Amino acid sequence: MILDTDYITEDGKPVIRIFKKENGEFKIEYDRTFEPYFYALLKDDSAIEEVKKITAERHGTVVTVKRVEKVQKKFLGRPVEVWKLYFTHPQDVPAIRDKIREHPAVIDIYEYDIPFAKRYLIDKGLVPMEGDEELKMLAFDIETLYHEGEEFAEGPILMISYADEEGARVITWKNVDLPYVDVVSTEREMIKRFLRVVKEKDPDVLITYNGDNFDFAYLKKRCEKLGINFALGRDGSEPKIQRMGDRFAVEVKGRIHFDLYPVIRRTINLPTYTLEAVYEAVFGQPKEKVYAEEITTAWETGENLERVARYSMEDAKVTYELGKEFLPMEAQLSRLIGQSLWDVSRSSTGNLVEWFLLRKAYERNELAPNKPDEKELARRRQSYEGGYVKEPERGLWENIVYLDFRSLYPSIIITHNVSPDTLNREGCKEYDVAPQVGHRFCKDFPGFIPSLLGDLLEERQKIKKKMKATIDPIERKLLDYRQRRIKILASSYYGYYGYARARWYCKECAESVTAWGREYITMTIKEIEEKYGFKVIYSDTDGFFATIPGADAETVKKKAMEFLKYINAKLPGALELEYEGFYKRGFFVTKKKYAVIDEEGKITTGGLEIVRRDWSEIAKETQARVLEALLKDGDVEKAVRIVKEVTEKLSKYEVPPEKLVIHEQITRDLKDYKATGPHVAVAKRLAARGVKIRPGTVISYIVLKGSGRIGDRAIPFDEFDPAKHKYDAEYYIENQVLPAVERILRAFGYRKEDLR
DNA sequence: AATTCGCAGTTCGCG
DNA sequence: CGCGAACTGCG
């Protein structure tokens, strides 16, 4: 199985290293025969000679164009003559590429920014994370000495905990009488001890939690001041810290540093992404937190050091149990994109799609288009029309069916071959024309993108089939992870079209897809009202809720099924309305604010506060019991006696503060907030005491009794002392609970005023 | 650093 | 200075 790739230099020449685990065994294949290159497009072939003479300086070294090669490729399906420019060393490319594109005789250059090792995996058609190979995983977390205002890592590391299938231990340099704590004399011995453990456990995967921004920058700076060789790598190297713009990320050669923090971000939407939060969110058992100053004083006074022990022990234990769950999922995502687990696990949705297209593009001899420079990214400004959203018949309805399309936007792409290479291609025999916007899409050949979309969805379909007939439950779970990722890969195509930074961005492709979507959704709605007498209560992009007023619970179901038969015959290609489910009751608040309950009693919400991190758990909780009292019980009164009793629990301060915390995210540098709400209030006030505040931090604040701006009374939740803090009850009534149930209960002749 | 669509609370500035 | 828009966050 392939694990990662990189290169080392050997006498000025690159050497690809491929890290394999072929049957329990770590192996390193070396490839000295791979040449870094990029692509040039010229005015005449007669320019190649003046281009080849182009030369650049690196680190005192002179950079030359090794050799040139003429090739034919397809740029956007058109045949294009291009000169492949070859180089002796990968680091030659970023030096010279600029000085080449500025040549008069060169129109542009392409695939000039592919990481040598990633390019190896493409060009050679190699795929990471492939095979039956069980990986040895080790998680680890640290604890540090935190005194405020200190520089980063000035204070020593107090503990280093780690976990695997055999359990957890903690390495520390004070006495703690716990059978899983190992005592040593000095912070240095502890580090060199942990360094030994990793060497003799020889894990394939090193699992942290935010190790890219904390645990590995500390372990490095401390290894600096203490002067320790941090030979974690299977080749003996130190953790290689890399700068991914905003933050950092750490690699460890011969292994896979699996930082879960970026995995949980992309994969799960949670209120806060603290390790403690995430562990309770994934496995349902609590995990208590121990805060920095508690760690400090407990370490200094030498008291209650057992408590800091189990915190650290449970940081490592959780982090393994977590990495255990999320690793195969990201293993299959690695296999699907064709790039290292380390890479994809840190990648955004757009980057994931592009690496996959970059692979397919190379397989189909398609010159990849560049990424937009500043100007092109500016002309990628004006937006397009999205879906059709129907201003709903606000209120409660009974006996309801939700019908939607099976994969509207991917199915539209395959059906009408929406692809930048088919868009308006002259000289075809057949075209599909897109509504409202009228782009022509050539039908004579499958487009680049639609060819992949179909291949994906078909492959997804074979997989489910192999799942159901397979016998190896390890295999089944893996397959399942793959197709779920294929689903999400498929369903990431339309956005990629309108993603302003994308290499294959096609605005035209994107608005086309939404224009069709609206024709298909609108026509299906007219044909269910006029032709089949349903009433369309609400409709959003790819589906609608409908009912036949006054008809039976089991009539509506049946006549719906009849309309599927009807409408599907009328829908071209893979377009297809399907029966999603039936809901004995459903309340519709506004556009994109709804809640249906099925015949079993499960309640599903959409756009509702009950599911937002920026609303307090007391609101979301009360709104839910409100939704139960209507949909599940029909008790409109109880839905008011519930609010009337919850408001009294706040006016008498009888409700836990832990419910009143509001979580919001920071999306920029604090210097860039044109206007300061309450989370930037606390954030500014927090980084003023010196805490790191990245774009992405979740501020978890609470609103205190007082007057004025909401922010002037906000405090981060950790600083909340209930004995010397009276939280603002009036706010959590008139700004948090009531406005979240008042829209549901105004529909019954109830005003906020008869809700306290 | 996937898209458009849309609700709404906080703040501040305008008549 | 009551109200509406800019700013913001997030499904």
Author numbering: 1 to 756
From the paper:
Kod-RI is an engineered TNA polymerase that was evolved from a replicative B-family DNA polymerase isolated from the archaeal hyperthermophilic species Thermococcus kodakarensis (Kod). The polymerase harbors the A485R and E664I mutations required for TNA synthesis on DNA templates, as well as the 3′,5′-exonuclease silencing mutations (D141A, E143A) that prevent the removal of newly added TNA residues. Phosphonomethylthreosyl nucleic acid (pTNA, also abbreviated PMT and tPhoNA) is considered a possible XNA candidate for information storage in cellular systems. pTNA is an unusual example of an XNA; it contains modifications in both the sugar and phosphodiester moieties with α-l-threofuranosyl sugars connected by 3′→2′ phosphonomethyl backbone linkages. X-ray crystal structures of the post-catalytic complex showing Kod-RI bound to a DNA substrate that had been extended with either two pTNA adenosine residues (ptA) or two 2′-deoxyadenosine residues (dA) were solved to high resolution.
Kod-RSGA is a more efficient TNA polymerase that was recently discovered by programmed allelic mutagenesis. Similar to Kod-RI, Kod-RSGA contains the exonuclease silencing mutations (D141A and E143A) and shares the A485R gain-of-function mutation necessary for TNA synthesis. Primer extension assays comparing Kod-RI and Kod-RSGA as polymerases for pTNA synthesis on a DNA template reveal that Kod-RSGA functions with higher overall activity than Kod-RI. To better understand the activity of Kod-RSGA as a pTNA polymerase, we solved the X-ray crystal structure of Kod-RSGA in the post-catalytic state following two cycles of pTNA addition to the 3′-end of the DNA primer. The structure resolved to a resolution of 3.01 Å, enabling a detailed comparison with the equivalent structure of Kod-RI TNA polymerase. The conformation of the pTNA nucleotides in Kod-RSGA strongly resembles the conformation of pTNA in Kod-RI in terms of torsion angles of the backbone and sugar pucker. The biggest difference between the Kod-RI and Kod-RSGA structures extended with pTNA is the structural rearrangement observed as a result of the R606G mutation found in Kod-RSGA. In Kod-RSGA, this position is mutated to a glycine residue, which allows Y594 to form a strong hydrogen bond to the same phosphate group previously contacted by the R606.
